[PDB]
Amino acid sequence: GNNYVYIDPTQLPYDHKWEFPRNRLSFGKTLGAGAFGKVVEATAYGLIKSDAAMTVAVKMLKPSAHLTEREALMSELKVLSYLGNHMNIVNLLGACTIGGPTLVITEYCCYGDLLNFLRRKRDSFLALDLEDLLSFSYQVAKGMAFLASKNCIHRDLAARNILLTHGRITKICDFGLARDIKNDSNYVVKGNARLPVKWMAPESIFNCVYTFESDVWSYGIFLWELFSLGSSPYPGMPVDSKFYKMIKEGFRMLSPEHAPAEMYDIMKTCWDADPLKRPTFKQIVQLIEKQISESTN
Numbered sequence: 001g002n003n004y005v006y007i008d009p010t011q012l013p014y015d016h017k018w019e020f021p022r023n024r025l026s027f028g029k030t031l032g033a034g035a036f037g038k039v040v041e042a043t044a045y046g047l048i049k050s051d052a053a054m055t056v057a058v059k060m061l062k063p064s065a066h067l068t069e070r071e072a073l074m075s076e077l078k079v080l081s082y083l084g085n086h087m088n089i090v091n092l093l094g095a096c097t098i099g100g101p102t103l104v105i106t107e108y109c110c111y112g113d114l115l116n117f118l119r120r121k122r123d124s125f126l127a128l129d130l131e132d133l134l135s136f137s138y139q140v141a142k143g144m145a146f147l148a149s150k151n152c153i154h155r156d157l158a159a160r161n162i163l164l165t166h167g168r169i170t171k172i173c174d175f176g177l178a179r180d181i182k183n184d185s186n187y188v189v190k191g192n193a194r195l196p197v198k199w200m201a202p203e204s205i206f207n208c209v210y211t212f213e214s215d216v217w218s219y220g221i222f223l224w225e226l227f228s229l230g231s232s233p234y235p236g237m238p239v240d241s242k243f244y245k246m247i248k249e250g251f252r253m254l255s256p257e258h259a260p261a262e263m264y265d266i267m268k269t270c271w272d273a274d275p276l277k278r279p280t281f282k283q284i285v286q287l288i289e290k291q292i293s294e295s296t297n
């Protein structure tokens with residue numbers, strides 16, 4: 001959680017142990033695509049077990065991507081390697097960096113992206129219930145606490161960047177190059193960038209600073225998305241001059257109908273204008289642990 005240092009991924013070395021024979025990959029359907037990159041479902045052979053086919057996700061540069069994007073993908077690969085493999089973050093499995101297009105291989109998450117999952121399961125609210133939502137809030141906070149412990153900042157925390165897999169385990173991801181931010185209305189032009197403004201802390205919007213605390217703000221917005229079962233934040237409030245003024249003034253979202261009081265309390269603290277008053281992910285983990293225990297029986 002040291003806001004005075006950061007991990008420069010170009011200084012991270014690429015561990016050759018990750019290198020995987022690209023001829024042992026069989027590419028499938030597109031899971032996401034941006035301008036210079038895409039994620040596809042694929043099959044990997046002898047990736048973990050010698051004579052076993054396993055489904056994976058593969059992030060690749062399109063032929064139309066430049067060195068800048070290859071560097072970014074390599075940096076992302078090194079960051080994932082640095083983070084290591086954890087229950088609540090997407091797991092790196094390998095890479096193909098030579099002899100073809102640069103590819104990064106991770107686990108495949110059988111329930112796909114959490115935002116789509118919530119939207120699909122909105123009616124079922126097997127069925128989705130409160131404890132599922134609490135579990136997702138807990139696991140995302142847990143994963144983010146780990147990221148912060150590694151002195152890493154997400155910068156785009158949102159339901160769309162969470163995946164869901166076996167046993168309803170969430171995995172923090174970052175589509176990065178592989179999201180079409182040009183045609184995603186959740187990304188708004190601000191200056192010479194398309195930014196996830198509705199998820200962003202005021203200090204990020206106005207001063208372009210991202211911190212452990214701005215990730216916590218985004219987590220608050222995520223909680224809102226979660227307990228609204230995938231609704232877009234600030235309903236009936238398009239990102240314009242009024243929006244910026246209102247956020248600066250102190251306008252905040254009301255509680256989702258399905259949020260327990262303490263979960264909304266967390267949201268409100270995450271959206272404190274003062275970053276120093278926001279909870280840490282470590283704190284949030286404890287709070288949600290308690291709520292989950294209380295919400296059982």
Ligand SMILES: Cc1ccc(NC(=O)c2ccc(CN3CCN(C)CC3)cc2)cc1Nc1nccc(-c2cccnc2)n1
Pocket residue numbers: 031032039057058059076079080090104105106107108109110111112113152153154155163172173174175178
């Ligand atoms: C194939 C791949 C390659 C790279 C990544 N990388 C990440 O998921 C990731 C997560 C966190 C960080 C940490 N990082 C720290 C610094 N900041 C600024 C950015 C975030 C970096 C990369 C994921 C994947 N996996 C991936 N990506 C998108 C979708 C899917 C997917 C979709 C549907 C079903 N199963 C899997 N799977």
